[PDB]
């Protein structure tokens, strides 16, 4: 009875917006109106050879010539402006309600079950500390991913508006926060209780954010990239395409949503090393590891094969439900 679905889908509630790299100066911080946006300038390089050679059957004369030679190419690498020291990040992510309200229903009875589970982990289990993962381990701006390395002062002003009128207003300092643990902060509970007012269908909340790294002068960045599949024939010169907004520098939504998906310390092996991104099969793309492998019973494709008939997860539910907040 109540077999699994041949077709399931769940809408990505709590989705996110794009980024607005535009450059400003600290103590001219509050005057973010006409903050000039940045465009990906193009470099050209002469490539050396750090690639470790194969050692199966090769020769020590080829490395002489090749390491002598130059396989040069061009790279579209974006630069800060001349005198602007702040960065800029307008990222208005918005939360959607009704956390398990599906899109597809292979069996409506299974949908009614899962909605009953949503009332279990929503009415029974609360989202204080869930939203305190989404703030207390995201206000520490893993948001600004590669640029977080040695910020001068990472100011995080997660603002919010009803309308044009902005009322949800709070200030932070991501450098004054940990990035391996979450700590008790009152205003962090104002924002996370505000997301409690978001996710569980109370008020429509789209958080127009203003995140400012006050780092340095004309330095480079780590802005979002593209691909070279069936574009490296007509170009063959640029080999790192930065994706652009309209005359600006993206940090796309696809890296950005695992800034607010890197929560779960409910990983199988580690303890405090790894704040991985809570996913189906729990794979981080960097380390090529599979926390929650098939051999463990910690699969998101097994948490309703266990919970939908057997009701036992016991507070690993949270990383089995935020598998369905995507």
């Amino acid at each position: 009875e109540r077999k699994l679905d041949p077709s399931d889908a769940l809408m990505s509630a709590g989705a996110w917006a794009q980024r607005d790299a535009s450059q400003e100066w600290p103590a001219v911080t509050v005057r973010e109106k006409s903050v000039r946006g940045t465009i990906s300038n193009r470099l050209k390089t002469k490539d050396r050879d750090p690639a470790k050679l194969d050692a199966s059957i090769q020769s020590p004369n080829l490395q002489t010539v090749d390491v002598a030679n130059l396989p040069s190419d061009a790279d579209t690498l974006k630069v800060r402006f001349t005198l602007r020291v702040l960065g800029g990040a307008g990222t208005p992510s918005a939360c959607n309600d009704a956390a398990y309200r599906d899109k597809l229903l292979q069996t409506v009875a299974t949908y009614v079950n899962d909605q009953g589970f949503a009332e279990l982990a929503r009415r029974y289990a609360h989202n204080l500390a869930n939203a305190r993962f989404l703030w207390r381990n995201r206000v520490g701006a893993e948001a600004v991913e590669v640029r977080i390395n040695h910020i001068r002062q990472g100011e995080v002003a997660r603002a919010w508006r009803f309308d044009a009128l902005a009322i949800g207003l709070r200030d932070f300092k991501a450098d004054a926060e940990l990035d391996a643990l979450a700590e008790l902060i009152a205003s962090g509970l104002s924002g996370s209780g505000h997301v409690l007012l978001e996710v569980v269908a109370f008020a429509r909340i789209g958080d127009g954010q203003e995140v400012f790294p006050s780092q340095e002068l004309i330095l480079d960045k780590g802005d979002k990239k593209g691909q070279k599949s069936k574009t490296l024939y007509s170009v063959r010169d640029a080999a790192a395409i930065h994706s652009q907004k309209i005359g600006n520098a993206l940090r796309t939504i696809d890296t950005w949503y695992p800034d607010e998906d890197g929560l779960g310390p409910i990983a199988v092996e580690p303890y405090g090393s790894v704040t991985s991104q809570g996913k189906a099969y729990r794979q981080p793309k960097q380390k090529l590891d599979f926390y929650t492998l098939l051999d463990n019973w910690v699969l998101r494709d097994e948490a309703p094969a266990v919970e939908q008939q057997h009701y036992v997860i016991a507070n690993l539910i949270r990383g089995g439900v935020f598998g369905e907040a995507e």
């Binding site: 070279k228 599949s229 069936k230 490296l232 080999a239």
Partner: protein, 78 residues
């Protein structure tokens, strides 16, 4: 059938070269990383050939996977 490693981070299509050896030849069955539905494969000599033509195709990195897939996929070999 006697499965071995991949070729260098292959999808972009939920597809792969997915090299796995035969008892004498080697099968590189271009297939899904999902259900298991494949398109046509190619059977030939060892890794000393496999890397040698796989290197020998144009494209930069991921392009070798790409032109590799369109090379196997318009196959000669049944």
């Amino acid at each position: 059938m006697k499965f071995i490693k991949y070729l260098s981070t292959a999808h972009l299509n939920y597809m792969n070269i997915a090299v796995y050896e035969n008892g004498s030849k080697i099968k590189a069955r271009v297939e899904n990383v999902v259900n298991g539905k494949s398109v046509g494969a190619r059977d030939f000599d060892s890794t000393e050939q496999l890397e040698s033509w796989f290197y020998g195709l144009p494209g930069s990195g991921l392009g070798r996977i790409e032109n590799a897939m369109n090379e196997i996929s318009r196959r000669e070999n049944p």
